[PDB]
Structure 1
Amino acid sequence: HPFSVKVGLAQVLRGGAIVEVSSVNQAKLAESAGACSVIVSDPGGVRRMPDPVLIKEVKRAVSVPVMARARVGHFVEAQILESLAVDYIDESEIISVADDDHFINKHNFRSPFICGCRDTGEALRRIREGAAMIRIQGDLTATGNIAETVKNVRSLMGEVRVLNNMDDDEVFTFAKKISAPYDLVAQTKQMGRVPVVQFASGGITTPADAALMMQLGCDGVFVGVFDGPDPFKKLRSIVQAVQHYNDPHVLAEMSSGLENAM
């Protein structure tokens, strides 16, 4: 399907960090430190898809894929981003929701979408609408706290394990309970995984945080590093961290004299 092709595009991000930038300067730094992508962002107040002149500028200043966010259910915003020819769209509950009853019909775009989730049904529901990639929403806000993120990764991975070993006869009732499409459930069982790239996001603040998500079994992380004291340094470390997550002596060195986190 054109869906596999999208699912396929999101696979080349496996093993990377995705940094959130709001200028060109910030994008040129994230790419330098080894980000495998940069997501373009505006930054209370209402938060929307960022200006195209800015998405244009970044797209140009870096050779890594460019992502941008669209408000949930704001399909016109997503049409614009597609038109600008960015590589990925993140239907992002981080900015101001625009439709509280419906998300984008992501099967109407060429672009591969990411959607956030807090549990398995949320992820399978986003997928069925046409998400080609998932991220465990976690603690939104700039709270620097991974708890909710760990909670959400844990719920997911664990829910999939329960599913994997389930009596086939019970999977129907299970599908009903998490409010997810049965066949995408049955799929997830067959593959013992969520049929799409699964990143962690929310509250990642230290090489250690990043390596924990990876050890929990994620495909990579998002980081939102510029509210720090040495963003290049810290960002390098998180890349190194994600790249060498099972290596404590490496993780130790990356964390050394890092300067203040948030």
Structure 2
Amino acid sequence: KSPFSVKVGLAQMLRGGVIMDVVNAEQARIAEEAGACAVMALERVPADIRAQGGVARMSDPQMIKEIKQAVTIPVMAKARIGHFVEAQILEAIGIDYIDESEVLTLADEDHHINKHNFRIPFVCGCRNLGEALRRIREGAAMIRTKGEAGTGNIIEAVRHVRSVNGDIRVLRNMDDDEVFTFAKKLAAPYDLVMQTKQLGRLPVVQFAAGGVATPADAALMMQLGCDGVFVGSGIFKSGDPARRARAIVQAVTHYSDPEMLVEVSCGLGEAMVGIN
């Protein structure tokens, strides 16, 4: 019944899905046709931001509108961390989600966007449970790992998923009397720590993000417990984007089916090169 619960419910519709970064309408159509649950509209994917440098900002509303016109699935877009006016603009465009993203150039070193001031749901990144809960308290309706975006290397995403999931599991059997100190150690709001304890999971949808390059990577994130995956660079920086996009979608939908994972991985073409 609360406005936040409605936002949380909206993000829950993306469960089981792949969200694909797209830089134009053609890629948006490829993503939707491959079965993406949503597209992330942006002018440069993380691998290109990482390689090219320069300040990375909110994308031009015109290019976001073109992508939004080109698909029927939900459209997300990125705002710089702390750049609440970029978020105001994105919301006024009429898109479905805002990603307050560390992949763009940090705009406010000390504060994130007060996301409760918006009608549109936000996704935020995290490396650990305390960070996830702090973003949620600011009003994020959806959490993803940060991983190491644009590297094609899942090691940090695995670290982040295992960190969040591990500390959630720690909460299950924890002495209630020890949770106050745990919340302090996490620098997380105690009421959200307690809610996570009661739920046995994050109070919002939890996606894997950062470095997902192969169907195996994506199914690994789902088997670790994520609700879905972002793929920013691994699809359209690969040798066969449309096929790999479908492959990753199938891997997320059928993550427990090794026969399917073989089938969609077989002859998939060159994955993104990435950085170790």
Aligned twin of 1:255:
265
Aligned twin of 2:242:
232
- Summarize the alignment of residues 57-96 of structure 1 with structure 2, pairs less than 5 Å apart: 57-96=66-105
- Summarize the alignment of residues 94-113 of structure 1 with structure 2, pairs less than 5 Å apart: 94-113=103-122
Does 1:198 pair with 2:206? yes
Unaligned runs of 5+ in 2: 45-52
Q: Secondary structure at the match of 1:229?
A: coil
Aligned twin of 1:52:
61
Does 1:7 pair with 2:15? no
> Matches of 1:102 and 1:152 in 2, distance apart?
21
Letter paired with 1:40: A
- The superposition leaves residues 70-89 of structure 1 with CA deviations (integer Å, 9 ceiling, x where unpaired) of 00000000000000010000
> Matches of 2:173 and 2:119 in 1, distance apart?
35
Query: How far 1:190 moved relative to its partner?
Result: 0.4
> Matches of 1:143 and 1:185 in 2, distance apart?
32
Letter paired with 2:253: Q
> Matches of 2:263 and 2:145 in 1, distance apart?
28
CA contact (8 A) 1:198 1:219 kept: yes
Letter paired with 2:144: R
Query: How far 1:42 moved relative to its partner?
Result: 1.9
**Identical positions, percent:** 69
Query: How far 1:163 moved relative to its partner?
Result: 1.0
Aligned twin of 2:254:
244
- Summarize the alignment of residues 162-177 of structure 1 with structure 2, pairs less than 5 Å apart: 162-177=170-185
Moved over 3 A (4+): none
Query: How far 1:41 moved relative to its partner?
Result: 1.1
Aligned twin of 1:182:
190
Q: How many residues align?
A: 261
- Summarize the alignment of residues 118-197 of structure 1 with structure 2, pairs less than 5 Å apart: 118-140=127-149, 142-197=150-205
Query: How far 1:14 moved relative to its partner?
Result: 0.1
- The superposition leaves residues 187-218 of structure 1 with CA deviations (integer Å, 9 ceiling, x where unpaired) of 00000110000000001010000000000000
Unaligned runs of 5+ in 1: none
> Matches of 1:91 and 1:247 in 2, distance apart?
33
